[PDB]
Ligand binder design. Structure first.
Ligand SMILES: NC(=O)C1=CN([C@@H]2O[C@H](COP(=O)(O)OP(=O)(O)OC[C@H]3O[C@@H](n4cnc5c(N)ncnc54)[C@H](O)[C@@H]3O)[C@@H](O)[C@H]2O)C=CC1
Ligand SMILES: N[C@@H](CCCCNC(=O)[C@H]1CCCC=N1)C(=O)O
Ligand SMILES: [Mg+2]
Ligand code: NA
Length: 260
């Protein structure tokens, strides 16, 4: 089984990004650019970005390149999408003066800066930024964070939180992933039968309704790249949960600012 974006996930990406940016600003005091500035020290200066469609594996995803095109323009990069896909697309991008290559198959989504040699992988970049946003919740009043999902996105997020000196509690429905996180990162295994309430939650799972009512507190932040939503509308509304959740753009920003 594979977790991949679908074209419907990406509809009106510009509005999705705007809403996410507003939520990030409300929660943390910074916009997405400022968050990236905090993580990486970098800012955009109209670097040329070539976006190469890839027919590998399950193939080109409807809306995917177009969404990257919009996302990169939104953050102030000089981006373009190649006509040709795959290697012929890569050549086209380089020939047309791209400084950064953005491309993805079903297992890897990367950004490679050809000018300074830095390369980013989407999975850790997404995990780090969504964890960073969570952790900057201005009205948190606590350094306890719950991390749900300790896979390719969730593990690097948890690791980041541990480095930033939060008290990280982690849960993954796969006992082996949980054990790997506790023994490699030193996080506290969360026991769902013995819950406690959090004001900061980071979720990175491909599953609905992973966040149980018992861990919620009023006005808590739930920062989640996971798709579909980790929390029902009912529980979101009931606790006035401040949700940060967007399908591509926040993690893409994290990749781009990390290679500047
Ligand atoms: N918004 C965005 O920009 C992006 C979103 N994603 C999405 O993030 C999610 C996670 O991606 P990866 O870490 O690569 O997947 P992964 O498969 O590496 O890890 C997911 C983890 O969640 C765990 N899990 C599943 N159900 C659970 C439950 N009920 N409770 C606790 N843990 C549970 C799994 O055991 C697994 O360890 C996916 O839905 C993926 O589509 C990924 C990249 C970027
Ligand atoms: N080769 C396709 C793209 C495949 C991308 C697959 N990866 C995902 O869907 C990741 C991208 C990061 C956000 C969540 N999931 C294309 O070029 O259109
Ligand atoms: Mg995102
Ligand atoms: Na989810």
């Amino acid at each position: 089984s594979m977790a991949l974006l679908t074209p419907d996930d990406l509809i009106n990406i510009n509005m999705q990004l705007q809403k996410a940016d507003s939520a990030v600003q409300e929660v943390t005091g910074l916009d997405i650019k400022g968050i990236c500035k905090a993580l990486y020290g970098t800012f955009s200066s109209s670097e040329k970005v070539g976006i190469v469609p890839v027919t590998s594996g399950n193939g080109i995803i409807g809306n995917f390149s177009a969404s990257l095109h919009a996302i990169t323009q939104y953050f102030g990069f000089d981006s373009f999408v190649t006509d040709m896909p795959d290697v012929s697309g890569y050549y086209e991008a380089v020939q047309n003066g791209a400084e950064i290559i953005l491309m993805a198959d079903d297992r890897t989504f990367l950004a490679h800066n050809l000018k300074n040699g830095k390369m980013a992988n989407n999975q850790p970049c997404t995990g780090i930024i969504y964890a960073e946003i969570a952790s900057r919740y201005l009205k948190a009043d606590s350094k306890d964070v719950l991390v749900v999902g300790l896979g390719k996105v969730g593990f690097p997020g948890a690791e980041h939180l541990v480095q930033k000196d939060f008290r990280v509690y982690g849960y993954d429905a796969d006992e082996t992933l949980l054990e790997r996180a506790t023994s490699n990162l030193g996080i506290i295994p969360f026991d769902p039968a013995n819950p406690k309430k959090f004001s900061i939650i980071f979720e990175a799972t491909p599953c609905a309704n992973t966040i149980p009512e018992a861990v919620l507190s009023e006005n808590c932040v739930l920062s989640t790249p996971g798709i579909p939503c980790a929390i029902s509308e009912e529980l979101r509304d009931k606790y006035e949960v401040q949700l940060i959740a967007e399908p591509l753009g926040i993690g893409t920003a994290s990749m781009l600012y990390s290679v500047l």
